[PDB]
Amino acid sequence: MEYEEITLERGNSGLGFSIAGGTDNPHIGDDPSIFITKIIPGGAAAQDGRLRVNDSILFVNEVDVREVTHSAAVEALKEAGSIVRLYVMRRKPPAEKVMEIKLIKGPKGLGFSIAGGVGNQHIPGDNSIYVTKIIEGGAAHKDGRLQIGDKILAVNSVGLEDVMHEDAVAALKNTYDVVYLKVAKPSNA
């Protein structure tokens, strides 16, 4: 989570940015703090570009705008003047990405320890199938390269999270000598 103050002088008749939300009617539905949605490539806002739209103005013109209704936010900008020295908070970039790995079957199996699905989601709150242990010189070890920490949401087109640890386990082993597994990175890091 990043934080810092900045001055946005009215390039002319305004800064140029779209906001929405309010401590009463959150723009997302779970954040009393207001944030911006987009900036117009014209006003001083886009020119100053000292912040992102999805940020959270921790403070504006020395006014409490961390969890106040929209009307109060509009009033803050209404009495902002021109050179608004506001303090915003922009969270770091996420980390949600879907990978595609190749894992070949082996005589002793695929050579890896994974657990997901209902009944045994492995993780205390995640039906997704995550890995926990890998053998040496295994099929997935060398090919898959899925070190302890990866999580597969589906093998090519399988539902490794729509049955149970048993069905997902049987569905993973039921794969072919050479199957592509769909892995995913921990969103929001």
């Binding site: 140029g16 940015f17 929405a20």
Partner: peptide
């Protein structure tokens, strides 16, 4: 939502 819209300022 329905009546209130974004503030472009």
């Amino acid at each position: 939502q329905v009546v209130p819209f974004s503030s472009s300022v």
